[model samples]
Target chain A: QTDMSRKAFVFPKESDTSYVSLKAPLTKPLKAFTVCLHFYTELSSTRGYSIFSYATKRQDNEILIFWSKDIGYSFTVGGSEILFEVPEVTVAPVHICTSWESASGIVEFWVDGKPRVRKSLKKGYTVGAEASIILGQEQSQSLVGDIGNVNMWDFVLSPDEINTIYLGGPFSPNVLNWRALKYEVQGEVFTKPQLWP
Target chain B: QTDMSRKAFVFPKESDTSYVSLKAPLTKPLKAFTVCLHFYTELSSTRGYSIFSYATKRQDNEILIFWSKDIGYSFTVGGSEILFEVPEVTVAPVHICTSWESASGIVEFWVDGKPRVRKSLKKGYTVGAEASIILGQEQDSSQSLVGDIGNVNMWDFVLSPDEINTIYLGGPFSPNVLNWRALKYEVQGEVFTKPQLWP
Candidate 1:
């Protein structure tokens, strides 16, 4: 039983396989979803930044939020992708959130309370609910930094709700709540509080 | 030094990656060309029939000859194409020859020594050299021919009707940009080289 609500997971070492498995509760198919988290990527990147990953027996990368210096950020849904351009930064923690719907295939991304352009990817496709969710690595090289405040919802969240969450407002994500998270640590990850004082 | 004059390439299965890479000897660009080849397609299905392809790094479908049922045979040059309606015969072997000139953009197609209609496509654009000439492929999506491909010859300039007829009746002219007798190639997936069979 782990409730990492006020703390962050610190990956002090660089690796290609280290990850934290988050146990997701779902019984049926997923029609929509939204993921919000805080993370920082190192300047030294090999494959790319692996923020999060969702895999099933059918598709390894069912849903992933991957980033790199050359192409910026990308959200892969059902093995297809739509890219988003964000400011390349080093050493500073980045606040990001993403939402996608199965019917319209439209995706929305927000960074530091600022929203990016809405794009459509993997139109008319359903995401498999039976998934193995992981953080710190997105099926590639590990993200050697801090990741915190990981919350998730089963449906698309509103823009005002997203803005409120970014400002440290109260939220109870039905999928995975940061305050009462249940995760399994694989390798070297230090438990520390949010460092923004 | 290598003689493939009497050899045929056999594509044994249906796949997206199985292909025979035919390397072209080119130091400059191309403005006109003629391609002659004898091939066999599977009579059971109509979903796959990619004969030969010419590709560059800038564009993979630079010059491709894709044969299908709904649209017949089509030649794409510089990412542009012209469709040709050929007689769809499933049982017989196919002997086809094509010629194209960039200036006039005229395309000529001949089937079984009988010349078909003339059309035009990709006007005023010279083909970039250093191509990945491929047989038994069309780049992506559709499957390639599952039968055999033999006697592929290409000339940098257009060929006359007499020359085209000569090639169809078993002849390989000298100074061919792509000589079937002395071809350079590589095998990627399951494509095999077999002896040519009489149809």
Candidate 2:
């Protein structure tokens, strides 16, 4: 009843956390980088979803990015406030895009290429060689949907860069990139392909 | 009652038409290019909207491109079938996104970028300089809406080159040639800066 209703891309379907991912190697490591995901869900963004980014720096740190329905707050960066809302016609599973750009100890999220949320934090985080990235329902494995195009760069993409790439790739850093990682239609029927070194 | 109620990035507030545009010059030339805008509107895309390309060439031949919603036809190109819809939400405004890629003449409209209406047509068209790129309402100021432009962008970057060359070179043909144009918050005001041929 409270579900998003229509979603083109759904994930982790019934005992299957069907998420797509890309593992890219760092050629020119940067001080900071951004992570963005375009996805859909039958569930409310209010229930919250998690995006996973794991990097090895002496060890492995798993950073969880999430959106909550009950306990969420709107954010702003670069003078633009982030806005997330449910549309007028139920889209079944619902489609939405989210992105976070990190630079100079600051991170900002853009929903559909528009600035949404931003925060400045000193995490001393830096991308290393061969960072592993993952997507979809993370807690376990239960839902599934279509996931396409996993894009990343060793260098931070400016708000301008984020806006441009959103149109389609050829981004500046061009460090690590992967298109169409996991999906049923492509029918890999088996394992995930290793994209990076 | 027809207005959407959500907060948006760039929406069509004016009465005449909703035009979100970027400036350009006449020097820098382009062979193959694509301009895309991520937009969502409350209007029935069934009545649809037309996509246009404008330039100066004797005023008659000046207009470069025109993609109409009727018959799903792209005036400059050929036939196409792309459907658009408004998403369901408690938010006041409905939303839909449409983008035109010049190279293959593929037009992709995404509700949120996850689900999309993808169709290809119109080839061999090029956007020269001395033009301005805008979205939301068409060039004729005909269709109007109270909608949000999630984002409007034009990229001269051709992925086919990277796929064909495999040797990542410089920026897209547009930016490399310094045909970069945008509305930067740092610059000032709510308008986009002029396209510098090359600074």
Candidate 3:
């Protein structure tokens, strides 16, 4: 019932119960999609941190995004995975984005505003609507840091559009918007300002 | 259809209607904001200059920043204004930034990374969206800028002193909203893009 657009969800400690469940903005299953978010963490990537999780009755790990010091960042669709090897951040916050299309089966990953090598995965598969979307913990191995600006689109966003989202420019999002979010807080998650935000 | 991050808008002569309207990045009314831009003018001491003007339908000058010889700089919000006195720009380039928040109504202005005395004004005023933003000219019948302006960046939230200094250093700027590199603008009367010479 409230918009957490101006604040960041602070995950101070790792807990099985600590997470935020978001209300789905789409009524139908997604055929093509793009997801973008901002993240900051001081914790070492040695341990697994589940940043985003979308679970369905068919499978809990239908779509997930996580990170580790060894593997960097990993994005999964329909349980298939694409790992992005990028510079590990200790203090500075970062913006990450990923897009997948059913037609091409191509999944593009982006760090900050730059694109990485693309890969094909989970083509012809559709994401379920009645999915349980959560942040901070992908159903466990919780995250310890801050997250903000989580926006999702139904179609694959172009490079120019991704640049806009990465730059925090004026954009019209078709799906979820972190600036105007509706979610339920569970456990010990706190919302606060980030880097003077 | 282009990226003008490496260039500045050159305003050669001052005209009544010669101005460039920037596409506003604002989606909703702004509760807080920080605007920074690089400007250079060799005009005259007696004349005033309008650096950045953000006009909403409810009010033409919702958030306006200007400079003059008589007065140093004027930052207006929701029709109320706070004036800052500083050295006028003559020949070299300068970086100017203004940050405002509705809760405290505190407005902080900085010129080339040096900040002026803070002022509180128009507290609790929410700026309207669907606004029209412009550079090189004021919204009304006022003196237009007779120089160059570019690298304009803004954020919906306040920028820390460290962040401000980082942008002033020109190391690698990552403006959340209104990035100068990906600027989208339309000039109606008289304006052109040229190489940015000043640091």
Candidate 4:
């Protein structure tokens, strides 16, 4: 949550995904933290549902997240597996206000302006490296369908923090601002959006 | 259990995965299959690994393959999972390879010629819509640090029509023939001879 005015980078009415990178760096490797986002979607058979994160390098640091119309949710990592299958896809225009938090870092996924998953990678997780954010699709093969509002944040927001930036009237000076660093939208068949909500 | 010569397309090397798509429109979906690959790295701090395939458009299929340095050993997607925990920087050039077959289709993973995981999709897994394939790093983000590889292969082989029928109908494709289809090679990667033994 941010105290600044809330703003959004919208990427809509298209068949591509919008990606953003958070240049936030940690002074020391964070043991616990969270990554968050606000997301909404339209029903399309052309695409299935799933999301994951990798360790930038090596398999030991890789973390994969799975969610679908069938299995509500679960995560798998080395030596550990969290199997929580729920039936949540039936509700279209879903909001995945989710979060991936480590011992010192956390990430939130907000769908329709709400938070869903609250993950803590705390025990053995650290913020040795800053993450590069991507929205719309999961990978090069994912962002092939149409999607709605998308946003991300670095630090974990408190009840008030979340409410302040996205909860209230989108008012606040430092609500949450993401400076566009580098984005590639135009390619063989699509155009890219640098800053999108 | 395919005989020698089976091959398939592999795209884990390039950060871009959309450039590759399933080659054929499969009539019947498979249940068990395998994908094999070998990655060069000794980092042991991490625990889990990920293998990717998109065939929903062609067929609704799912399968899991184990990953580790152990050869001649693997756990099924339904009951097992692979765990790897290496240090931040080590010299254990961890190479991975996997092969699997399912009621839907089959695929193999060969890293630098070594097989890591090979698994088949679930049964009733009919593949018709060719899917886009991506490997190495996830497409949405460019931060995935991809270690180099030697080669990757994807195959569309199942023995003869009789063998296909036998295998498809829950019978065995005695003397399976591992034919070659989509093969890609990432030059400059090392091969461990024994790892290259794909016969």
Q: In model 4, where do residues sit more than 4 Å from their true spots?
A: A1-28, A42-47, A50-55, A59-66, A74-85, A88-92, A104-122, A130-132, A136-141, A146-154, A168-182, A186-197, B1-199
Per-residue lDDT tens digits for candidate 4, residues B12-74, read: 332433232223334444343333333443222343333333334423223333333333223
Candidate 1 Cα deviation (angstroms), residue B178: 0.7
User: DockQ of all candidates, in order?
Assistant: 0.00, 0.02, 0.01, 0.01
Per-residue lDDT of model 1, residues B45-95, tens digit only = 466477988888888888888876655787788888777654445666778
A1-197 in candidate 2: lDDT tens per residue? 11111122323223243444444544664565555444434334324444443534443433444444544423322223343433432324221233334445555566556675556643455444555555554433322333334455544567777777666555433433444232222211112111111
User: Which candidate gets the maximum lDDT versus the true structure?
Assistant: 3
Q: Cα deviation of B182 in candidate 2 (Å)?
A: 51
Superposed Cα deviation of residue B2, candidate 2 (Å):
39
lDDT tens digits by residue: candidate 2, B43-83: 43344443444544322222223333334323332232333
Clashes of 3: 3
* Model 2 segments more than 4 A misplaced: A1-12, A27-30, A55-61, A73-103, A137-144, A179-197, B1-199
CAPRI class of candidate 4: incorrect
Candidate 2 chain A worst ten-residue window by lDDT? A188-197
TM-score of each: 0.48, 0.36, 0.50, 0.34
Question: Highest TM-score, which number?
Answer: 3
Candidate 1 residue lDDT tens string, A35-63: 99988544433356788898888999889
